[PDB]
Design an enzyme around this catalytic site. Sequence first.
Site, PDB file in Angstrom:
ATOM      1  N   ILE A  14       0.813  -1.225   0.000  1.00 47.59           N
ATOM      2  CA  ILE A  14       0.000   0.000   0.000  1.00 47.59           C
ATOM      3  C   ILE A  14       0.847   1.276   0.000  1.00 47.59           C
ATOM      4  O   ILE A  14       0.324   2.370   0.278  1.00 47.59           O
ATOM      5  CB  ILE A  14      -1.080  -0.002   1.140  1.00 47.59           C
ATOM      6  N   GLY A  15       2.126   1.143  -0.333  1.00 45.43           N
ATOM      7  CA  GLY A  15       2.997   2.308  -0.426  1.00 45.43           C
ATOM      8  C   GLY A  15       4.270   2.223   0.374  1.00 45.43           C
ATOM      9  O   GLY A  15       4.728   1.136   0.724  1.00 45.43           O
ATOM     10  N   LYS A  16       4.887   3.384   0.594  1.00 47.08           N
ATOM     11  CA  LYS A  16       6.160   3.489   1.297  1.00 47.08           C
ATOM     12  C   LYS A  16       6.322   4.869   1.891  1.00 47.08           C
ATOM     13  O   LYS A  16       5.700   5.830   1.414  1.00 47.08           O
ATOM     14  CB  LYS A  16       7.319   3.194   0.330  1.00 47.08           C
ATOM     15  N   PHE A  19      11.733   5.622   4.583  1.00 50.93           N
ATOM     16  CA  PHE A  19      12.390   4.317   4.646  1.00 50.93           C
ATOM     17  C   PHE A  19      11.264   3.362   5.018  1.00 50.93           C
ATOM     18  O   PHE A  19      10.297   3.778   5.649  1.00 50.93           O
ATOM     19  CB  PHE A  19      13.458   4.275   5.753  1.00 50.93           C
ATOM     20  N   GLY A  20      11.362   2.113   4.636  1.00 50.04           N
ATOM     21  CA  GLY A  20      10.297   1.191   5.005  1.00 50.04           C
ATOM     22  C   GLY A  20       9.137   1.201   4.040  1.00 50.04           C
ATOM     23  O   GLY A  20       8.675   2.258   3.597  1.00 50.04           O
ATOM     24  N   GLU A  21       8.647   0.001   3.746  1.00 49.31           N
ATOM     25  CA  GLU A  21       7.573  -0.280   2.800  1.00 49.31           C
ATOM     26  C   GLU A  21       6.319  -0.586   3.605  1.00 49.31           C
ATOM     27  O   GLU A  21       6.394  -1.253   4.643  1.00 49.31           O
ATOM     28  CB  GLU A  21       7.974  -1.473   1.951  1.00 49.31           C
ATOM     29  N   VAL A  22       5.165  -0.117   3.126  1.00 49.38           N
ATOM     30  CA  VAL A  22       3.906  -0.232   3.852  1.00 49.38           C
ATOM     31  C   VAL A  22       2.988  -1.281   3.248  1.00 49.38           C
ATOM     32  O   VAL A  22       2.839  -1.349   2.026  1.00 49.38           O
ATOM     33  CB  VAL A  22       3.205   1.155   4.011  1.00 49.38           C
ATOM     34  N   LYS A  35       4.395  -1.096   8.577  1.00 41.89           N
ATOM     35  CA  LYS A  35       5.550  -0.504   7.893  1.00 41.89           C
ATOM     36  C   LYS A  35       6.735  -1.395   8.189  1.00 41.89           C
ATOM     37  O   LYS A  35       7.023  -1.700   9.358  1.00 41.89           O
ATOM     38  CB  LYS A  35       5.791   0.952   8.336  1.00 41.89           C
ATOM     39  N   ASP A 136       8.138  17.095   9.140  1.00 42.21           N
ATOM     40  CA  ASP A 136       7.845  16.608   7.788  1.00 42.21           C
ATOM     41  C   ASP A 136       6.341  16.574   7.487  1.00 42.21           C
ATOM     42  O   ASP A 136       5.815  15.636   6.872  1.00 42.21           O
ATOM     43  CB  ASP A 136       8.531  15.262   7.535  1.00 42.21           C
TER      44      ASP A 136
END
Length: 302
Positions: A14-16, A19-22, A35, A136
């Site tokens: 479902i995304g990123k 850092f780290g992929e979701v 994540k 951010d």
Amino acid sequence: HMTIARDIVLQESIGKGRFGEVWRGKWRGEEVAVKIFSSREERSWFREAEIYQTVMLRHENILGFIAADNKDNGTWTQLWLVSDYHEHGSLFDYLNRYTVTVEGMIKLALSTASGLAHLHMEIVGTQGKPAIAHRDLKSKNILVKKNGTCCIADLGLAVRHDSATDTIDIAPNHRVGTKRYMAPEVLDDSINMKHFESFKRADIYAMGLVFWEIARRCSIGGIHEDYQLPYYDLVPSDPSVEEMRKVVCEQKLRPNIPNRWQSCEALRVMAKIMRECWYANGAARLTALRIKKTLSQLSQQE
């Protein structure tokens, strides 16, 4: 009874984040967002777990943290951060897909301001909450709930304040966030990074940019603007600090406020908030608490 990684099954990418992929995972039949970080991203994963575990952080407009865990598949270890899953995804996704009503816009803006005021506010007492600055904030880092309210997410770059000493829990690096949303003082490196209030003020500027994105999508009598990121008209799609600095610091431009936003009280209140988030000098900006008070009064009226 607590949610743990071994009991979660990944279902869909479902995304990123930075850092780290979701992934959308399932825990006892329920969707959860996961994540995933590699072993070499341990510092990024640990810092985000640390921020999410801050005492008294939970709030309806802050992404709900579930767990930090490890999962060893037999070859390598994955480092997991598990949180509430929101089907709509980010405010960026939501605004690209839909237009909002006046009510819809106020709900999104008020819930975002409420989450930020909570993050920014120190809660004194035995289970005290430190003041936190995001660093951010952007439409891609805010999620939209099924009830049409927002929650702030992606707290990995946050800084926490110790009020008694006026010190920050980490040694912040310059220009860590998303270049497009960096405050003028961040872009030109003039920000005093030993001053915690300077980080809160930079978040306000970014929240003003997010409010601009929402207002464009506020449809009245079928009239609205197409979705755009702030500065779409002035900088490339993946802008450098130098491209942003020339526009924001030197030419001193801000996102354009359409004339049609002067024809509606809710849009006039939103446009005034935006202007008052966008001063080059952070000390002149509105606080998240003042913005929340203003939007609360506007929601009561509407």
